[PDB]
Each structure stands twice: as C-alpha cells, then as structure tokens.
Design a protein around this ligand. Sequence first.
Ligand code: CLA
Ligand code: CLA
Ligand code: CLA
Ligand code: CLA
Ligand code: CLA
Ligand code: HEC
Ligand code: BCR
Ligand code: BCR
Ligand code: BCR
Ligand code: OEY
Ligand code: CL
Ligand code: CL
Ligand code: FE2
Lengths: 244, 30, 334, 37, 57, 137, 97, 27, 442
Amino acid sequence: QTLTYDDIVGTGLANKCPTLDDTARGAYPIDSSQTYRIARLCLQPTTFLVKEEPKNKRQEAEFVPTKLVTRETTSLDQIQGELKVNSDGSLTFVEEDGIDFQPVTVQMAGGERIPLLFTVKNLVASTQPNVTSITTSTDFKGEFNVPSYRTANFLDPKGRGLASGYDSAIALPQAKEEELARANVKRFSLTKGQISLNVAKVDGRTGEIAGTFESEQLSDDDMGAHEPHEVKIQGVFYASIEPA
Amino acid sequence: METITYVFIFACIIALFFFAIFFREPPRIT
Amino acid sequence: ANLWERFCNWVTSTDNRLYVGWFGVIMIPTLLAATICFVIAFIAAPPVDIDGIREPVSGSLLYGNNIITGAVVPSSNAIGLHFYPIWEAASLDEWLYNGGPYQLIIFHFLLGASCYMGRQWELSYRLGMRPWICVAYSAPLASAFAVFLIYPIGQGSFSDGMPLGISGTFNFMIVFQAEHNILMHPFHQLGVAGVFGGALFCAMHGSLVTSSLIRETTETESANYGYKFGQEEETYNIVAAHGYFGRLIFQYASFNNSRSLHFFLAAWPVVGVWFTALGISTMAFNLNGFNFNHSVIDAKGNVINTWADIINRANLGMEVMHERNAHNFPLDLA
Amino acid sequence: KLPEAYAIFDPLVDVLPVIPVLFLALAFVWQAAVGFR
Amino acid sequence: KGHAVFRNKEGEELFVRRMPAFFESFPVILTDKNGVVKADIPFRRAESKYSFEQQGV
Amino acid sequence: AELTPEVLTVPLNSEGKTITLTEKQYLEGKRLFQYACASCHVGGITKTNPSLDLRTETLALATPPRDNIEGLVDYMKNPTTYDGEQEIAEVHPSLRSADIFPKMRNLTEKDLVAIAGHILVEPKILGDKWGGGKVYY
Amino acid sequence: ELVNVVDEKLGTAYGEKIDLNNTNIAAFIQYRGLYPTLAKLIVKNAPYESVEDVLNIPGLTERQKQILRENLEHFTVTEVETALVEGGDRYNNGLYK
Amino acid sequence: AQLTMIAMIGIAGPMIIFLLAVRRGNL
Amino acid sequence: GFAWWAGNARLINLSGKLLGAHVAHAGLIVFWAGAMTLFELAHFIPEKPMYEQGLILIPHIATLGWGVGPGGEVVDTFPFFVVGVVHLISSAVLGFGGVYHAIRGPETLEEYSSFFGYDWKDKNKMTTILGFHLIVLGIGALLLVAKAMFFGGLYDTWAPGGGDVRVITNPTLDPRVIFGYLLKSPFGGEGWIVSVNNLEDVVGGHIWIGLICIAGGIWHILTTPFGWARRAFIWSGEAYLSYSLGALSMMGFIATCFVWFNNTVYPSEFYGPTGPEASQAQAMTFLIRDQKLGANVGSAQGPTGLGKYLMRSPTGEIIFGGETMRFWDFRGPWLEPLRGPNGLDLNKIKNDIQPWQERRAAEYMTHAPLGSLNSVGGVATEINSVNFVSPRSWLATSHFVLAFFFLVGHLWHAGRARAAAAGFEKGIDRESEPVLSMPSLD
Ligand code: CLA
Ligand code: CLA
Ligand code: CLA
Ligand code: CLA
Ligand code: CLA
Ligand code: HEC
Ligand SMILES: CC1=C(/C=C/C(C)=C/C=C/C(C)=C/C=C/C=C(C)/C=C/C=C(C)/C=C/C2=C(C)CCCC2(C)C)C(C)(C)CCC1
Ligand SMILES: CC1=C(/C=C/C(C)=C/C=C/C(C)=C/C=C/C=C(C)/C=C/C=C(C)/C=C/C2=C(C)CCCC2(C)C)C(C)(C)CCC1
Ligand SMILES: CC1=C(/C=C/C(C)=C/C=C/C(C)=C/C=C/C=C(C)/C=C/C=C(C)/C=C/C2=C(C)CCCC2(C)C)C(C)(C)CCC1
Ligand code: OEY
Ligand SMILES: [Cl-]
Ligand SMILES: [Cl-]
Ligand SMILES: [Fe+2]
C-alpha cells in the first residue's frame, strides 16, 4: 500500500529509505549487451561515529558514538546515475544527480558539536569482476567528493569570508595580523571519502536492491580555521535499477 | 571569574527581594 | 467544614501575605517554570541555531557572554511555528541546539503574565475595590504578547520573536526598523508620545505634589515624616498646586479635580502603549510605516531626497546585513 | 463600474460609504446642541 | 616606516581615502589625484572591477 | 532642469531615425508602465530575474535590439529571450498572451509607444538609478 | 602560505575576460547572442583546455558557431577553481542587484 | 462634483438638529 | 447618574429605547455592507486581479460562487450589484425601525407586551431570547449549506484545472473529521480550525453547527439555568455584554489568523497569496529560472551547507530552502502537483513544471502581503511605484485591532459588572472599608 504525502507528513517517515521484504533474496541478472541505470539510490544513516584524538604517543583513539542534534534531516535520496558494465564483468555506478548531501551536526561526549557534510557527491562505486547477477553477496566499493561544509559566500560572525566579506579583523584595527592569518584567510577544502555498499536483499522481479552501507569522510574544518575530524557513518540503503 | 561575579550579584538581588517582602517595616495605621 | 471548601477559602483568602487566588493557581507554577528555565538557560545553555542555518549563536554566560550580550536565543527557523516541547525531541541535546528553552519560557511566561492580570482583578474584588487596575496592566501585557507571540505568528517563525536578552532586544529593534520602518509608523509615534508624556506627567505630578507639601516637619528631618500611613487629611495643598500650575500656563490648562487628574495620568501612557503594542501587532502582518522613498522629484524627474530617503539608506544597510547567511533569493519576504 | 443605467450615480456612490462615520459626528453636534447633558 | 606611495599598473599615483574620526571601521578606497576611484579592496568579489589584483597596485 | 524635447527624443528604430515624445506621452507611458509592468520592473530591474534589467545598454545588446521604440513595441507583442532564441509569451505579459495576462487586453498600439517611450526616457533622467537596484535608492 | 584563492584569481585573465571554466553564467549577458542558450551550453560542457574548445560543443548549429567565433576574444580559460564551481555557484552565485 | 453630493449629505445631519432646536423639540 | 460620555449606559433599563439603538445600529452595518459593495463595484476593473484593487467585499461574494467562472475570472458583475443594492435598501427599513423605537416608540417595553419586554435578572426570559437568536444563527449557517448544495455551489480554488465554481454533493458528516479539527493543535503544521482545506469539510461543519445551534435554541427556550450556572455567573445587562465582548474578541483573533493563513475559504485568486504562499512562490520562481539555465537544483549546496533550493524539514520532507524553510506547511493548488510521498518530488520538478505554475509563482511572489501604510507595495526599503497593500494585511490588521479592543472592553465591563453586582463600583464606603476590618498582614 503506497502512502500519500498527507500520510507521511510529520511522521519522520519521509527521512527513511524504502525497505525491501525479508523474502527478497533473489538475484538480478546483468546482460552486458544492455545498459542500466540506478533510478533512485536512497541512503539513510543510523549511526554517526567520530574518531577521537588520543593526544599521547602510539595509541590511536577509536571511533566514539555521538548524538544527532539536527533531527530527521539526514538521508540522501533521489540519487541516480549510470550503472556501467566493464570489460571484466564488474559493475560501476557513476553518480549523476540527486539530493546527495545533508549537513549533519552530532555532539560528542563533553559537548563538542561536530558538523559534517554527509555526502556521496560524484560517487563512483564498483563491484568485483564477473558479476553477471546482483545477489545478496554483492559489494560495491567506491569513493566520492567531500566539498567544504560552507561554500564560498559564507560570512563568519565578524563578516570575514572567501568570495565575500572582510579580509581582516576590523574590530582590532592595529592588532598584529600574523596571529590571525588562519582565521582571516578562508580556504575551500575538497577531500575524498570512501563508501562500502553491501547488498543484503534483492527483488529479482523489480530490480530493487537494499542493504547496508559504511562510509568514511572528514568533518567540517570551518574554512581552514581548525582541523577536521574523521567520521564513520553507518546505515541502510535502497536502490532501484532500470534498463537504461 | 566574571561568570561567578555576575551570578553572585544576581543572587544577592534575589535574597534582597526575600527580605524586602517578608522582613519589611510593617506599615501601621495613624 | 468540608475539605474542598477549606481549600477554596485558603486559595481566596485575603489574609495570605501574598494573595493566591484562582488565577494564582495557574500563575504560580507557570512563572516558576519560566523563571527556573530562564535562569539556567541564561547561565549554562549551549549555543542555539536560531536561524536554522546550522550557525549556532552563543547566548549564555558560561559560553563567553556577559550580562549585556547574553540571551536565551529564539528557537530554530527550521521549526517555524511548530510546537517543540521537550518530549518532541530525541534528546535534551537536540532540544538545546534547536532553541527548545525559548519556547518553554515564553509560553509559561505569557500564561503566567495573563494570570497575573486576572489576579489583579481578583484581589480587587476580594478587597471591595474598583476593578480596572488590570486594564492598565493590559498595556504592558499586550506589548509582551506582540513581540513574543503575535509577531512570530505573522512572520511564520518564533526565530523572529524577540530574544530574551539585552543585545538580543536591540537586534530585534534594528531588524524591525529595516523591514517595517517602524519609526515612520503612526502607532509607534503614539507609543513614544505615550511614553515621553508618561515620563513628563510623572515628573510634573510628582513635582506639583512635592511643591505643595504642607509644612509638618523641621529642617532637620525628612519632610516624608509629615505624612503618617492612614491619616485622613491630605498631605498637600491642591489649590496651591493648581494656583501655581494654572499661572505657569493658564488657569484652564490645569486640573483642580484630583480624580480627573489621576484618571488622566492613567489614561495617557496606557492608551499610548496600547497603540504601540498594536503597532507591533499590525506590522506582524506587514502593514508597515509610511513610505516616502522618492516622493519628491523635480520638473525633470530627478529624485530630490528628503530626510525620509536618508532613513531609507540606513534601513538598507540594516537590510543587506542582517542574517547575512540566511537568504538565498533576492527578496526577504518574511 | 456600475451598470450603465445607473452610471449617473457614480459621484454619489463614491461618497456613500463614509455616511456611517457621519452618524458618529452627528452624535456630537446633538450633544453640543443640548450642552453635553 | 616611511611614506607609502601607491601606484596602479599604469604608473598613476593613487591615494588612500583616509578614515574619518566618526568611523570605527572604513573601507580601503584608492583614488587618483582628481578623486576618481581607481582601486579598492572589494567586499563582494564576483563583480569586482577595482581589485588590487586587477589594477596592479 | 526640466523635461525638455532633447530628453524626450528617443530612437525609433535601428536605422537611426528618432522620435520626440510629448510630455503627455511620457506621463502616460509612466502611468501605463506602473499599471502593467511595475510589479516586476519597478525602477527598471526585473524582480523575478534580476540578471536582465531595462537599462538602455542592456536593451541594446539584446537580440532583436530593443533599445528603440520598434524593438520595444515588438517585444510587448512577441517577447523573446535575450538571444531571441525562443518566444516567451506564455510566461511574460504581451498582446500575444493577453488571454493569460488580462492586464494587456485593453492596451492600444498608442499605449505601447508610450510604455516603450517611458522605458527609453527614464535612464536619461535617473541615470544609474534606473535598473541599478537598491544600491542607488 | 594562506592565500585567498578568489582574490588570487582576480589577478589572472579571470579578472578581465569571461572565464569559460569559472565565471558565473550571468556574465554572458555582456555580449550579444550568448544568453541564455549558448551560455547554458557553455557552462554545462565546461571545463575547456582552450577557448577554441567551445566550437566543438556537440549540437552547435552553424549560427551558434558564428556567434562563438565573434566572441572568442572575450573568452579565456584558467584552471578550474573549486571555490567558484562548487555549490552550483556558476548558475547562482548569490548576487542579484 | 462629488463634493456637491457630500455637501447635501453632510448638511442633512446638522439640519435635523437645527430644525428641532429652532422648533424647541425633544433634543 | 451617568455623565454624557457614558450616555448610552442610560439605556440599560429602557428596553424600548435600547431596542431602537440596536436596530438603528444594525441599520448602519447593513448600510455599510451595501454602500461599500457598490463603491467597490463602481471602482472595479475586471482586467485587474481583485487584490490589486483594494477589494474586501467583492471577494467575499465571489467566494460564494457569484459572478465568477473558471480560474476566478469575473464573468458577470450583476450579482455584485444586487448584493449591494439589497443591503443598502434594507438599511432604510432597519434605520426606520431604529429611530422610531429610539425616539417615538414606547420608552420601555415590559408594560406594552409581556413577550417583548424583558428584565435582565429574569434568567428564563434571557435564555429564551438566547434560544431565539441561536435558532436564527442555525438557520443562517444552513443558508450556506443550501447555497453550496442546491443553489450553484461555491468557488473551489482546489478544483481541477485552475479552480472553478463547484456544487458540493458529499458534505463531510463524519464527526471524527468535523470535530477532529476542533482538537488539532493551533501550532505550525496543525493550525486548528484554520487548516480546513476543502469545501466538503466546510459545508459539513456548517450542517453540524446549524443543527447544534437549533438544538441549543430549542434547549434554551425549554429550560432555565441550573443551580451551578446560577451560582457561577453575574446576571445583569452589563455582565451579559461583557460575555459577548469576550466572545467577539476571541472570534476576531481567529478570523485574523484565518485570512492570514487559509487560502481555501479565502482563495488567493481573490485575496492575493498568503505570506507563506508568496515566500514559497519566490523559492519556486528561482528554482525554475535556475534549472532552465542548467542548474541541478537537487544537488546544489548553499552557503550554509544546506541545500540552496531544496532541503529537508525536521521530520524529513523535501522542502524549499532559504528562509522559506519556515513556511513548509504551506499548501496551495499551484504547488501540490509537485508533492510526492516525501515532499517535493525531484523528478516532477525536473520534468513536470507547467507554464501556468511558472506564471502563478511569479505573480504571487510579486504580490506578497507586504506594503506601507500609504500603499507602497513591497518591503519597507522599496521606492514608490506600485500602489498595493494585500487585502490579507488590511483584513488581518484591522481585525486584530478590533479583537484587542473588545478584549479590553470585556475586561472593563466584566470587572464593572462584578463590582456593580456586589455594590462597590462607585467607590469604597468610608464608614465600612473592608481592609480596615481585616487583620494586618504583618
Ligand atoms: C458591543 C460593544 C459595546 C457596547 C454596546 C458598549 C456599551 C457601553 N460601554 Mg463599552 N466598550 C467597548 C464596547 C462596547 N461598549 C469596547 C470594545 C471598549 C474598549 C475600548 C469599551 C470601553 C468602555 C469604557 C471605558 C466605558 C464603556 C462604557 C459603556 C457604556 C456607555 C458608553 C457610551 O456612552 O459611549 C459613548 C460614546 C463615546 C464617548 C464615543 C467614543 C469615541 C471613540 C472612542 C473614538 C472612535 C473614533 C473612530 C475610531 C474613528 C473616528 C474618525 C473621525 C473621522 C470621526 C455602555 C453600557 C462606559 C461605562 O462603563 O458605562 C457603564 C465606560 O466608562 N465602554
Ligand atoms: C450607533 C450609535 C448610537 C446610537 C444608535 C445611540 C442611540 C441612543 N442614545 Mg447614544 N450616544 C452615542 C451613540 C449612539 N447612541 C455616542 C457616540 C454618544 C456620545 C456623544 C452618545 C451619547 C448619548 C447620551 C448622552 C444620551 C444618549 C441617548 C440615546 C438614546 C436616546 C436618543 C435621544 O433621545 O436623542 C434625541 C435626539 C434627537 C431627536 C435628534 C435627532 C436624532 C435622529 C435619530 C437622527 C437620525 C438621522 C437619520 C439620518 C434619520 C433617518 C431616518 C430614516 C431611516 C427614515 C438612543 C437610543 C440618551 C438616552 O439614553 O436617553 C435615555 C442620552 O441621554 N446617547
Ligand atoms: C429585532 C428587532 C425588533 C424587535 C424586537 C421589535 C419589537 C417590537 N416592535 Mg418594532 N420594528 C422593527 C424591528 C423590531 N421590532 C423594524 C425593523 C421596524 C421597521 C419596519 C419596526 C417598526 C415598528 C413599528 C412601526 C412599530 C413597532 C412595534 C413593535 C412592538 C410590537 C411588534 C409586533 O406586534 O409585531 C407584530 C408581529 C409581526 C408583524 C410578525 C411578522 C413577521 C416579521 C414582520 C417578518 C420577519 C422577517 C425577518 C425578521 C427579516 C426580513 C428578511 C430580510 C432578511 C430580507 C415590539 C415591541 C409597534 C409598537 O411598539 O407600537 C407601540 C409599532 O407601532 N415596530
Ligand atoms: C451563543 C451561544 C450560547 C450561550 C451564550 C449559552 C449560554 C449558556 N448555556 Mg448553552 N448551548 C448552546 C449555546 C449557548 N449557550 C448550544 C448551541 C447548545 C447545544 C449543544 C447548548 C447546550 C447547553 C446545555 C446542555 C447547557 C447549556 C447551559 C448554558 C448556561 C451555562 C453555560 C456555561 O456554564 O458555560 C460554561 C462552560 C463550561 C463550564 C465548560 C467549558 C468547556 C469548553 C468546551 C472548553 C473549551 C475551551 C477552549 C478555549 C475552546 C476551544 C474549543 C474547544 C472545544 C477545544 C448558559 C446560560 C447549561 C444550562 O444551565 O442550561 C440550562 C446546560 O446544562 N447550554
Ligand atoms: C486573559 C484574558 C482574560 C482575563 C484576564 C479575564 C478576566 C475575567 N473574566 Mg473573562 N473571558 C475571556 C478572557 C479573559 N477574562 C475570554 C476570551 C472570554 C470569552 C471566551 C471570557 C469569558 C468570560 C465570562 C463568560 C466570564 C468572565 C469573567 C471574568 C472575570 C472573573 C474571572 C473569571 O471568571 O474568569 C474566567 C477565565 C476566563 C474566562 C479565561 C481566562 C484565560 C486565562 C488567562 C487562562 C486560563 C488557563 C488555561 C485554562 C490553561 C491553558 C493551557 C493548557 C490548555 C495547555 C475576570 C474579570 C466572569 C465575570 O464575572 O464576568 C462578569 C464571567 O462570568 N470572562
Ligand atoms: C513579471 C510577472 C513581469 C511583468 C508583469 C513584466 N515583466 Fe518584463 N520581464 C520579466 C521577466 C522574468 C523577464 C526576463 C525574460 C527572459 O527570460 O529573458 C522580463 C524581461 C523584459 C524585457 C527584456 C529586458 C532586456 O534586458 O532585454 C523587457 C523589455 C520587458 N520585460 C518589458 C516589460 C514590459 C513593457 C512590461 C509591462 C507590459 C513587463 N515587462 C511586465 C517579468 C515581468
Ligand atoms: C443612502 C442614500 C441617502 C441617505 C443618506 C443619509 C441617511 C444621510 C445621513 C447623513 C448624516 C447622518 C449626516 C450627518 C452629518 C454630520 C456632520 C456634518 C457632523 C459635524 C460635526 C462636527 C464638525 C463636529 C464638531 C464638534 C462639536 C459639535 C463638538 C465638539 C467639537 C467638535 C469640533 C468635534 C439619500 C437620502 C441621500 C439618498 C441617496 C442614498
Ligand atoms: C438614534 C440616534 C442615533 C442613531 C441613528 C442611527 C444610527 C440611524 C440609522 C439610520 C439608517 C441606518 C439610515 C439608513 C438610510 C438609508 C436610506 C435612506 C436608503 C436609501 C436608498 C436609496 C435611495 C437607494 C437608491 C439607489 C438605488 C435603488 C440603486 C442604486 C443607486 C442608488 C444608491 C441611488 C444618533 C447616534 C445619530 C443620535 C442619537 C439618536
Ligand atoms: C463550521 C465549520 C466547522 C465546525 C466547527 C465547529 C463544529 C465548531 C465548534 C465549536 C464549539 C463547540 C465551541 C465551543 C467553545 C467553548 C468555549 C469558548 C468555552 C468557554 C467557556 C468559558 C468562557 C468558561 C468560563 C468560566 C470558567 C472557566 C469558570 C466558571 C466561570 C466561567 C463560566 C466564566 C469546521 C471547523 C469543521 C470547518 C469549517 C466550518
Ligand atoms: O528579518 Mn529579514 O525577514 Ca524576518 O526573516 Mn526574513 O530575514 Mn530573517 O529570520 Mn529573523 O529576519
Ligand atoms: Cl541579524
Ligand atoms: Cl531566502
Ligand atoms: Fe497623586
């Protein structure tokens, strides 16, 4: 039974990705003479993990859990793109378009807010060679782009920005500028992330798949003001496949 | 230290409210 | 002798040091809730994303604010006018980030202040007084309703209600002038007249009564001891006051009826503040102050600026800068 | 615009809505006539 | 430190507009001897006509 | 200064012929512009697409040049995009779309000339203000 | 070491011509026949290694190629600058009037 | 003009008061 | 012993003259309704939207389905003429009856007829007069049902294909819907009764209210107040007046929010778009423009990191970005074709926007209910040119003012009625001051 907007509104269901029936253990055959695309890719995070700084020598702190504070605003959806077949039977999805970013801020123990641009922008994810069928053991592994959390027009609270704003600390007219360079000169970062999509359900009839994802990326660096954190994101995904 | 100072003054004002109301000189008639 | 009737008698008792009453039964808890939440938020609340753009504003003392700059920050623009009680949040952490305490504080305060006005009626009835002191207090009350409730309703978001803080108040004022030209609105101008005139007539009345105090004391004592609480005779000479003030201006521009005078004192600031509360409440629906931008032009059609256009230059600079990250499209329509 | 057959009354219709206000003013002429009794 | 003389790429001498006492902050505007604006430090960069980079100051 | 015939002289076409409007026409053009156009084009900007204003230098670079009476009168009949590549009568008021823009219904040919004339005169009086936006208010 | 990359870009041909790889689409209004149809095609098919590359946009009619040739001297290319092309800022850079 | 009709209308009110005052009526 | 400035308080116990006052006053209301409609018609120009013309009565008549056709286009102005004329004519009759009862008629009624005469302290007669008017009101509400179902219908902005006059054949009777509205929260996304969004619910609620009012009319004719009600109220003219003052105040505040938010019984075709609507329309307008230029509005990150054109609501729905994120509860017929189960459908946005939607958005955005007191349209910094203030701002502000003063009138008259009923409204009796017989507080 397909729900209407008025059934969804305010329930939080709009943030969830479609689930697949637990029976859906099929296989979707791939005919390399055909072309395919993902009509909709939906990613829905359930867990945000942030890597801690152990400060000492050789300890390498682990990922600690965090509390989401920005509510049901986290899912990527309506993502689409080419699903290509390569000369070794591997499949590559090339992301084209979609709602492929959500700003998220989670809170660590101790109160630090970590904002991040949860994204799969420009995702390119590939399977193993010789797939011929998408099954409940297929894995996609890929990398994507993580642009700056704020874009170039963003003005900090003292009016300083990159493509706009003041270029100095105008409230301190005769202060020495050398100590303020990091905060006066905004920088647009562009970093890569990594993602694994693991297929656990397949509706062979409809071309729908569903499963689990883990991605790793960098948090917000506030236009170079401070160093980012490393973020692990876990959740569920849903994709629908079509002959192109 | 400035937070302590701000809250200290505010708390002194609330205690003064208590005394000004409950420990006022009672108004007596004629 | 029944339990309920004994309770009713204590509630409405005129012997309680502070009158409780049926309005007090709603007022006491709602004001305590608002007060406790305000004092704690003002000291320790983490920053709030007032404008919903994931740009949290720090308002509390422990996050680097002083008395002048601190504020409980309005709730997120992403919430708009939605009800956001604690139990609607996944956690207190989320509720704090999104401005939860502002909503809790202002709703309890509007209730408790409303009951405060009722309580003024109620005690007045228990003591056998005339009833209209609560009508005088409806002027400040309406003004609080206007900036905490009415204006957010008209603009679609509690994020545009007035912040509970000293600089937050000034921010509200500057943004309001840029969008509503409130200085050029007649209802604000009457408000200034109600409030300037109120201060004027306060000073006048205090000086005229003080000027005509009847000598009852020596030079070594406060003249205040010339009056004893509950004495039947007046303590000043109203004809001497009338005789001075009628000559300072002219006779018929002076009150000799104390009742007309004190009613005048009540009416002028009350009515003026009603209008300024109505001004805020009607600019809530964007019926703004007079616009004379480019109203004067010459024989060719050159604009001839007036003081109104200079105001507009100031208004523009407030416009283009406020919430500098929050606007993606060229018209700030709300 | 009014129907053509009533077009003659345009200036009267421009004035009619203000008439209720005149009743309020009329009340003060009456009270001035009897000396605010 | 010495007297600062500013010139654009065409060798014209330019003059920084001095801050008036009224202003806590003032924009950086460089004029020629006639008072015509020839360079500045822009706030919005996209439609900048007069940047130091463009004018070779 | 005054509304002299020099300022009321605007190009008629691309050939270079000109026409001198009357003060009647100018005021009539200003009034009709306010009636039919100002809600989007107040002060010579375009509220619903600020990249395209009514400055004479902008009109001049449009395809069909529109910096003359003919081009402007033609535009109010068969508006196109800036490069002239597509007709946009369905989203822009014109006589071609007076059914869906009812304010264009009762505009005569004479009215178009006045509206066009006002658009061409007004930057001669106001200069940068016309089409410059709030920076020049 | 810390440099504002947009200011730096104003010191290049980006600061004097229409950069086919970076400039926001509203700048193609400064020359006749470019906006919106060719400007759209140009922006969508960036980047270009040379100004000449735009003539090889698949689908150009012969008149569109003529308009491009007429305007090639107003064009330039510089390295793509992430700060100017992210966020869809080539279609809307937040500047109106 | 329109000021003709609103003159006839505006004078109607005060005339009722006047006639009753000059006839000593129930005012 | 009232002064001239409290002169109408002299009518409290003069039922004959007080009747003439009410009926004369009823004449003024009918007069204004008649004169104002004619004034609006005489100024009306059908080629302009109603809301560019300062009309508030013609939109009330249009909304009832008179004079309009598909899309709100005015097709026939004669029904407007009729409504004004009939009102105007009827005011003479009420005017006539009012001045007769106020001047020549019996000064008091109770001696002329035990039926029409009344005493404020007669709780039975009072509830009978209440019952009579309750029945009248119920009939009044059923009139709206009759028009809707049997006499042409009502204007339906939601009707398929641009809106149209539509006869209502299935009024909603389910009390779970009808009274569900009375229990929705007044806050954002709920909006209490102001969220009613279809004529079926509108007509069905009027069936209910009509029956409830007639049921209650009959009830109050047949009964006398129970003892708990007798001991709870003040039973006096002024007390009764203060009760109605409270009720009108409350109703005025409600109507204020109705005209400001509701675009169903105040169609935007007639009244102009709402505040939320106009703000949504701006985001739509630049979505459309930017996407025509090649922008991928789904994946455009704005300066804050939130999407520039589209983002999620706190419960997940895809909504317009920017400041209009606050107005995402807005529903309108030009927008809904784009909504799917998760909010705005990105596939419909890329493929299915129609020119009429582009037109409607550009129009509503350039007609947002912002304007100056002297009717300069737009934000406070706009230059003179456009002579426009939305009917919604006029109707919202005026009725907020009236609603506020009537709440003040309620307080004034309620407190006085209490004090008068207990006998200390003229001041404290020196010889018997209550406080002087109370023990001291301390
Ligand atoms: C249903 C509405 C209603 C009714 C029937 C009454 C009836 C009454 N009121 Mg109440 N009153 C109301 C609403 C109402 N009131 C409201 C809403 C308020 C709050 C504003 C009050 C506040 C109020 C007070 C303070 C008092 C009364 C009093 C009275 C009594 C005498 C009133 C009198 O003689 O006025 C005579 C009329 C005037 C003096 C005219 C006033 C002029 C108004 C204020 C100016 C408005 C002008 C308008 C806005 C625009 C003018 C434009 C210009 C071109 C002319 C009478 C019982 C008196 C009382 O207690 O008696 C028992 C009293 O003291 N009323
Ligand atoms: C809607 C407004 C309204 C209405 C209907 C009334 C009605 C009334 N008032 Mg109130 N009053 C009002 C406003 C109003 N008043 C205001 C604003 C004030 C403050 C100035 C007062 C102050 C006031 C005082 C001080 C007193 C009243 C009294 C009265 C009553 C007796 C009138 C009388 O004897 O006059 C006699 C007046 C005349 C004969 C003059 C002519 C008046 C007529 C009606 C003019 C009608 C003109 C109209 C165009 C004719 C069309 C007729 C056509 C339909 C055929 C009457 C029921 C009196 C009362 O209570 O009596 C016990 C009283 O003492 N009123
Ligand atoms: C609600 C308002 C109201 C009330 C309570 C009264 C009450 C009274 N009037 Mg008054 N009267 C009114 C309105 C009102 N009248 C109006 C509007 C007019 C002008 C036409 C008059 C003209 C008038 C005169 C000339 C006289 C009275 C008299 C009387 C008394 C006797 C009435 C009688 O026996 O009727 C008899 C009953 C009927 C005729 C019942 C017939 C049903 C009615 C008329 C039709 C219902 C139509 C509906 C209500 C609305 C019309 C439709 C419209 C919406 C299009 C009584 C105290 C008399 C009096 O006091 O003498 C000392 C007297 O001489 N009245
Ligand atoms: C103009 C309308 C009107 C008026 C003034 C009255 C007046 C009266 N009615 Mg009547 N009544 C009416 C319409 C009206 N009635 C209708 C239409 C019906 C049919 C359903 C009835 C059925 C009715 C009954 C069955 C009884 C009365 C009774 C009474 C008396 C006591 C009322 C009371 O204590 O209320 C005070 C109200 C309360 C103490 C309860 C308030 C609870 C409300 C619903 C809370 C909601 C608050 C919130 C702000 C409102 C928003 C909407 C909400 C539902 C969410 C009084 C004379 C009583 C009486 O003595 O009759 C002989 C009685 O027993 N009425
Ligand atoms: C802030 C508004 C306010 C205030 C201060 C008063 C004050 C007064 N009223 Mg009025 N009343 C109001 C609004 C108000 N009223 C409204 C809007 C109406 C119409 C719906 C009425 C209807 C009314 C009647 C019918 C009567 C009074 C009476 C009285 C007087 C005695 C106390 C009483 O019975 O009140 C009762 C209280 C109210 C009716 C409402 C007060 C609202 C308070 C501030 C909030 C209550 C808390 C609320 C239930 C909790 C909401 C939160 C929760 C739901 C989430 C007193 C002077 C009585 C009197 O003696 O008059 C002569 C009387 O019989 N009032
Ligand atoms: C909003 C509903 C508008 C109204 C009313 C009017 N115009 Fe307009 N205009 C509007 C837009 C969105 C655009 C850009 C169209 C495009 O995509 O190219 C325009 C454009 C013009 C132009 C061309 C400007 C240029 O520099 O080439 C002209 C000359 C113009 N519009 C004139 C005009 C007139 C005369 C109007 C009153 C009849 C009018 N417009 C109303 C939006 C709207
Ligand atoms: C509809 C119609 C009609 C009717 C009409 C009417 C009904 C009228 C009425 C009218 C009126 C009803 C009028 C009145 C007027 C009034 C006035 C004109 C007033 C004045 C006033 C004044 C001016 C004041 C003064 C004063 C005083 C007295 C005291 C104090 C001070 C003062 C200064 C305030 C007719 C028949 C025409 C026919 C057509 C249609
Ligand atoms: C008591 C009193 C009072 C009051 C009064 C009143 C309020 C009255 C009312 C009255 C009224 C309320 C009146 C009315 C009237 C009306 C009329 C008289 C009508 C007429 C009509 C006509 C004539 C019409 C015509 C027409 C037509 C048919 C068509 C269209 C056009 C025209 C419009 C022309 C006062 C306060 C003053 C004083 C004291 C006492
Ligand atoms: C039509 C319609 C509808 C419906 C509606 C309805 C059905 C209604 C209902 C309503 C109602 C059903 C109402 C009710 C109300 C109530 C009230 C308002 C109450 C009040 C009360 C009071 C006021 C009280 C007070 C008091 C107290 C508390 C204590 C004691 C004393 C006294 C009594 C004073 C709808 C929406 C669907 C839709 C549209 C249309
Ligand atoms: O004035 Mn300007 O307008 Ca009322 O919203 Mn749009 O911007 Mn922002 O959130 Mn507070 O503030
Ligand atoms: Cl701000
Ligand atoms: Cl925005
Ligand atoms: Fe005093």
